[PDB]
């Protein structure tokens, strides 16, 4: 019943995970061999070696994906914010699945404002990912994954804690409205029309 050191989100690491899926992770052989005594750099290694895709659960076997297992280990470890930021930045410039992992993790352990602020600029990232759902492996993208994190109640077979809606933060003026790499809709429309007619003749 006692609580381990709490995440900045305000929720203990155990509760945010569902009993079935986490016990399913613990039972898995892959977890038993690869997840014992793993330093941050070592998890980076396990990532770059063994993760070719992203999902919470796969197949009728309901075997947890290495992505989710390493996510769970990272969850238990509860690393500090600066080093995970540096992690997603560097690893991200080098590789995408590391970014996916860090992003999922931050969505789990961090407060709304922080998550929004750090994740939103990565909507620019278009890098292609393969995602294994309950059925088949559908192709997806980093930006789509981020947007999913922000707008979806359940991601990677893990329920997502109800997040304070962004426009609410807007009206309270704690944060400035999201700005895409592109401008407002109308100016994009006008410049694209103009460019099209100009190129065409």
């Amino acid at each position: 019943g006692s609580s381990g050191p709490l995440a900045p989100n305000g929720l203990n690491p155990a509760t945010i995970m569902e009993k079935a899926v986490r016990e399913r992770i613990v039972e898995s052989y892959f977890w038993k061999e690869q997840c014992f005594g793993v330093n941050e750099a070592d998890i980076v290694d396990r990532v770059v070696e063994h993760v070719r895709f992203v999902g919470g659960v796969t197949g009728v076997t309901q075997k947890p994906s290495p992505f989710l297992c390493l996510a769970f280990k990272l969850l238990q470890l509860a690393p500090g914010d600066d080093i995970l930021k540096e992690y997603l930045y560097f690893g991200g410039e080098k590789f995408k699945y590391l970014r996916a992992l860090a992003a999922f993790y931050i969505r789990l352990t961090r407060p709304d404002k922080e998550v929004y602020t750090l994740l939103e600029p990565f909507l620019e990232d278009r890098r292609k990912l393969r995602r294994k759902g309950k059925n088949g492996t559908s192709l997806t993208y980093m930006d789509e994954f981020i947007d999913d994190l922000l707008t979806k109640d359940r991601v990677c077979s893990t329920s997502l804690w109800k997040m304070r809606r962004r426009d609410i933060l807007e009206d309270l003026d704690l944060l400035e409205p999201r700005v895409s790499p592109l401008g407002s809709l109308e100016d994009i429309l006008e410049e694209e029309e103009q460019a099209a007619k100009n190129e065409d003749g």
Partner: peptide, 21 residues
Amino acid sequence: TAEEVHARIEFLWQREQEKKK
């Protein structure tokens, strides 16, 4: 902390460069 991760990731990258060779 993060610096160790730096060294590890660099090692990995150089390894990948060696693989591409």
